[PDB]
């Protein structure tokens, strides 16, 4: 099998079950197949990894694992003991087994152990029993693979899980060396790209890592992750990944935006890029996703086209976003010119209009019917809507300068002219 | 009966019924009395306001109004119809009456009509029927009052609902004179103070407004309101309103942070103030809040402190004011940056050390907040505490390097370009 779908792998508030069930639906509807359960701040997945699900918790996990099986979505349950486990101690291993057992008993056939984002050193007891940190991680993963009866799907996210993070480089690293040789070939390996959130996964790099882990990796794709940035939301097409990868990978699971209803484009487009090569056009995919999405929401396609361009991708805005920026950077740069300058006025009118569209998009989203979709994006949409007002009104101001020398702020304000609070202040002092 | 409580009056996601029920337990526990239902973006409160509650929603609301009664909290159902209402069409009016009735039959004994943040003009049909904008609100308000039967509490939120919003000024306002004189002496007038988010609500000003409206107002307070800035949370004490205001006011209803669990200080302290030092009142509130944290139960084998909560509050304090520990770190970082050119200077290194340790405590605070049992509390503040800890790591780094390209995204890019940041 080639695994492709979603890892609920982000920091912060996890999705509730009825969200996760509506996801299984969509994974099927768009011919995707897998779901890795690994939400960082569901306490029993990581911080209290030793703890057995309670009775009422168990029923929920079980009813969830049901809805997955019902929808032919392959539920992988993960656990992240990386933080504080003593790898060398037999009682510690027994807990890990016992817990994995407990979930097996809900339905779960597929499993996963994640060792991302943890201290590279280990305790006293482990230094004796194990030559290297890598030897320790592979040991208990093996022992656990064999204990569970060697299941069809069983993943291992390493500590060195992207290019930037391998000491000293990908090919020369003791850690990824050890994992390739010593880690059982029935275990898959998770990889995020050259970096944690990757702009591009070039084919050259996936070969460079395929050799050292001795297999075709499974990609945890942080492309639409938004848990690192309070103001950021990613509605862009699945992009920067060559279809030409598919053959050379065992899967791609996209770790997407925390806000559930904003992952429509993020998954729908991952679907078209899986389906295309079981080449592919990011700009086309987007148009397909945005037209289909619009059925769910009076809000227009142009509105959504704008929205997605305003909140596009980690390393790239969308056309209408990037152009609005260009013009505003031009308009303020050449503003000292208040014959020969009919240009600034006619462009400042073009601009003040495109600002008017962002206002209208917001009016129309707030009058929409799908409140689940409204609430998940409200604070993102209000922010752009309102920065654009201050921008539009600041271009206005630069214009009415020919015949005024009032300040840009009229006296004493409401708070929301001085944004970001303390965080905001600290940030404006970094260079 | 003086009104004191919370108005769920904010833009964005509204609170769920399981939360609103929790609100009622607390309001009773702290001897507060009112709740004003007014969440701007709850479907049928405003946008689709004419539309009547489905039978499944009618069930949920009746269960809510009941829970309000169970906890001896008065429930005031408000409606905001002022966007697209034709004030003279009797189909409009009869669709309002019919809605209010629908709520009335869920229990609701008290009501409110909200005309805030709406176009100061009206369609040509109403140009005919009423002389000014005031007159049309006053008329449909006064009728709906009598129609329902003059209930004990009925509230009206004006369009000129604060000092800055009055034209030309507070006292000589056409609009406010028309409300004062012609609005039935039984109903009540809402008022947010000098400004929308008043840093201070001084006594003089409440007299200046009480005259022009012929009555003592009910304060819709936006001191702890959060909806206007995606990165701001407000956990500091109720402040800037003299206890002398109580004799001159019919109530205070605080419109607080969108994140439910984040409002324990804002309301705890309002209730303290209802019976004042805001520094004392916080300690009282933080000390009591701390018990809600806990650490999960464990059948196998670092817990949040009061010093932690004091730092959390100080970093997310009030709209016009940072808390002391926030202010201090920001002073110390301003001194370290501006004296980075001195790399006799043991002082910079001893203050570098102390600030790097101040930074550490912020990271410690998130670590402990992450390991706590109350996950409701953790989820509601997560993206806020995350942000502060990550800026502080970047700042800790940067201070050590004396011895975020796309950050904020498009919004952030445009915002850096405005020359007022």
């Amino acid at each position: 099998h080639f695994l492709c779908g979603v890892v609920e792998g982000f920091y912060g508030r996890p999705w509730v079950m009825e969200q996760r069930k509506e996801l299984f639906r969509r994974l099927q509807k768009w011919e995707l197949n897998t779901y890795l359960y690994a939400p960082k701040d569901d306490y029993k997945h990581r911080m209290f990894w030793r703890e057995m699900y309670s009775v009422e918790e168990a029923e929920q996990l079980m009813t969830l694992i049901s809805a997955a099986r019902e929808y032919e979505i392959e539920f992988i349950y993960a656990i992240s003991p990386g933080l504080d486990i003593t790898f060398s101690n037999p009682k510690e291993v027994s807990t890990l087994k016992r817990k994995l057992d407990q979930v097996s008993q809900f339905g779960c056939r597929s499993f996963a152990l994640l060792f991302d984002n943890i201290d590279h050193n280990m305790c006293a007891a482990d230094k004796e029993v194990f030559s290297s940190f890598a030897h320790a991680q592979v040991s208990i993963t093996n022992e656990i693979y064999q204990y569970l009866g060697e299941p069809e799907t069983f993943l291992f996210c390493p500590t060195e899980y992207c290019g930037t993070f391998c000491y000293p480089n990908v090919s020369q690293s003791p850690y990824l060396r050890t994992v390739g040789e010593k880690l059982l070939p029935g275990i898959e390996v998770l990889w995020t790209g050259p970096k944690v959130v990757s702009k591009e996964i070039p084919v050259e790099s996936i070969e460079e890592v395929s050799k050292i882990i001795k297999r075709a990796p499974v990609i945890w794709d942080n492309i639409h992750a938004n848990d690192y940035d309070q103001k950021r939301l990613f509605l862009g097409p699945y992009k920067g990944r060559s279809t030409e990868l598919i053959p050379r990978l065992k899967g791609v699971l996209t770790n997407p935006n925390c806000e559930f209803e904003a992952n429509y484009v993020a998954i729908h487009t991952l679907a078209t890029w899986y389906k295309s090569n079981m080449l592919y056009s990011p700009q086309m995919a987007l148009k397909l996703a945005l037209t289909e999405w619009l059925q769910e929401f009076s809000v227009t396609l142009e509105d959504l086209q704008l929205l997605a361009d305003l909140f596009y991708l980690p390393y790239e805005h969308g056309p209408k976003g990037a152009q609005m920026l260009r013009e505003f950077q031009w308009l303020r740069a050449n503003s000292s010119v208040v014959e020969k300058i009919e240009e600034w006025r006619s462009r400042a009118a073009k601009f003040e209009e495109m600002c008017g569209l962002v206002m209208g998009m917001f009016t129309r989203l707030s009058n929409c019917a799908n409140r689940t979709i409204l609430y998940d994006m409200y604070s993102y949409v209000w922010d752009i809507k309102s920065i654009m007002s201050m921008v539009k009104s600041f271009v206005q101001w630069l214009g009415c300068r020919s015949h005024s020398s009032a300040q840009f702020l009229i006296g004493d304000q409401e708070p929301w002219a001085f944004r970001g609070g303390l965080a905001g202040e600290f940030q404006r002092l970094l260079p | 009966h003086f009104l004191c409580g919370v108005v769920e009056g904010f833009y964005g996601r509204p609170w769920v019924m399981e939360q609103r029920k929790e609100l009622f337990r607390r309001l009773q526990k702290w001897e507060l009395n009112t709740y004003l239902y007014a969440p701007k973006d709850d479907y049928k409160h405003r946008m689709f306001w004419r539309e009547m509650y489905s039978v499944e929603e009618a069930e949920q609301l009746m269960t809510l109004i009941s829970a309000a009664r169970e906890y001896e909290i008065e429930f005031i159902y408000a409606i905001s119809p002022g966007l697209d209402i034709t004030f003279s069409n009797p189909k409009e009016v009869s669709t309002l009456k019919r809605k209010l009735d629908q709520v009335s039959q869920f229990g609701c004994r008290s009501f409110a009509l909200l005309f805030d943040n709406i176009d100061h003009n009206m369609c040509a049909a109403d140009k005919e029927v009423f002389s000014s904008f005031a007159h049309a609100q006053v008329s449909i308000t006064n009728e709906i009052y009598q129609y329902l039967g003059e209930p004990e509490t009925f509230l009206f939120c004006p369009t000129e609902y604060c000092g800055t919003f009055c034209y030309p000024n507070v006292s000589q306002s056409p609009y406010l004179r028309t409300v004062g004189e012609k609005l039935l002496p039984g109903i009540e007038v809402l008022w947010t103070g000098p400004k929308v988010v008043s840093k201070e609500i001084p006594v003089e000003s409440i007299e200046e407004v009480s005259k022009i409206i012929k009555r003592a107002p009910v304060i819709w307070d936006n001191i702890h309101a959060n909806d206007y800035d995606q990165k701001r949370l407000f956990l500091g004490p109720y402040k800037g309103r003299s206890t002398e205001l109580i004799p001159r006011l019919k109530g205070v209803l605080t419109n607080p942070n969108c994140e439910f669990e984040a409002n324990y200080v804002a309301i705890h302290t309002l209730a303290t103030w209802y019976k004042y030092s805001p520094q004392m009142a916080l300690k009282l509130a933080l000390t009591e809040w701390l018990q809600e944290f806990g650490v999960p139960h464990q059948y196998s084998s670092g817990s949040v402190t009061l010093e932690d909560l004091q730092l959390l509050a100080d970093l997310f304090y009030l709209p016009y004011e940072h808390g002391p520990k926030g202010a201090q770190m920001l002073r110390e970082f301003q001194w370290l940056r501006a004296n980075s050119s001195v790399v006799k200077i043991e002082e910079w290194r001893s203050r570098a050390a102390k600030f790097e340790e101040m930074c550490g405590l912020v990271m410690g605070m998130f670590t402990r907040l992450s390991n706590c049992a109350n996950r409701t509390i953790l989820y509601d503040m997560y993206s806020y505490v995350w942000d502060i800890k990550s800026i502080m790591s970047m700042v800790k780094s940067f201070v050590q390097w004396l011895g975020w390209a796309f950050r904020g995204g498009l919004a952030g890019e445009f915002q850096r370009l405005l020359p007022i940041d």
């Binding site: 690192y228 | 990550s390 975020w404 950050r407």
Partner: peptide, 4 residues
């Protein structure tokens, strides 16, 4: 980038 920014961070994990």
């Amino acid at each position: 980038s920014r961070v994990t």
